Design a protein around this ligand. Structure first.
Ligand SMILES: [Cu+2]
Length: 229
């Protein structure tokens, strides 16, 4: 139960919900065909378009509730330790980030922190270790102009049952400067890219004693592979 609710560019805190299309509530989206799977549920929107340069270090801040922790010593801030799973980042080219409809956009994945079989660590584990933040670099090669940056936590604690995997989502409205000439080799539709019966969505991640280690097996994240320049 968390909400990506704040961007940071090379450390520069862009402000709570500045240029964010983010849910009001922290309830999970579980129907992978739902329109809520693009930028999460409808709720907060913004008129800001975050000015970034191709290559910048984007940090995305997840917290239990809007504002941060729901109460002093909140055990589920930034997210509950049980919510093991990957975190994923997509881009989609638009004319005007502020106006653009979230529907029908051609998405492409730029980054993912999935699972490490050896160290037994998930994307969410790093999320928590980084006090809610998730850092990644915007690819150098992408072409200038407006994008929707779509960061997405996938929690797989109950994902052993069909349609019980949990998706947490939000979109930063951004604009890219000092870019290249990379158009994606292929794109994916949202909703559409994820199938409920995927190895990464329908999956039991619990080992013998019941620890969420995926029996030290390599996780296969949903959607396309991250791009490369
Ligand atoms: Cu939850």
């Amino acid at each position: 139960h968390a909400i990506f609710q704040k961007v940071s560019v090379n450390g520069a805190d862009q402000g709570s919900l500045t240029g964010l299309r983010a849910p009001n509530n922290n309830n999970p989206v579980q129907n992978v065909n739902s329109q809520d799977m693009i930028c999460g549920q409808s709720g907060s929107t913004s008129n800001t378009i975050i000015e970034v340069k191709a290559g910048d270090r984007i940090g995305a801040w997840f917290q239990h509730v809007i504002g941060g922790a729901q109460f002093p010593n909140d055990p589920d801030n930034p997210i509950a330790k049980s919510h093991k799973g990957p975190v994923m980042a997509y881009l989609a080219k638009v004319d005007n980030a502020a106006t653009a409809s979230k529907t029908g956009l051609k998405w492409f994945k730029i980054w993912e922190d999935t699972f490490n079989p050896s160290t037994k660590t998930w994307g969410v584990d790093n999320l928590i270790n980084n006090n809610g933040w998730v850092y990644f670099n915007l690819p150098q090669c992408i072409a200038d102009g407006n994008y929707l940056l779509r960061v997405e936590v996938l929690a797989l604690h109950s994902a052993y049952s069909q349609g019980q995997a949990q998706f947490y989502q939000s979109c930063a409205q951004i604009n890219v400067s000092g870019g290249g000439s990379f158009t994606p080799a292929s794109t994916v539709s949202f909703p559409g890219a994820y199938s409920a019966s995927d190895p990464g969505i329908l999956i039991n991640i619990y080992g013998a004693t019941g620890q969420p280690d995926n029996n030290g097996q390599p996780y296969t994240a949903p959607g396309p592979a991250p791009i490369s320049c």
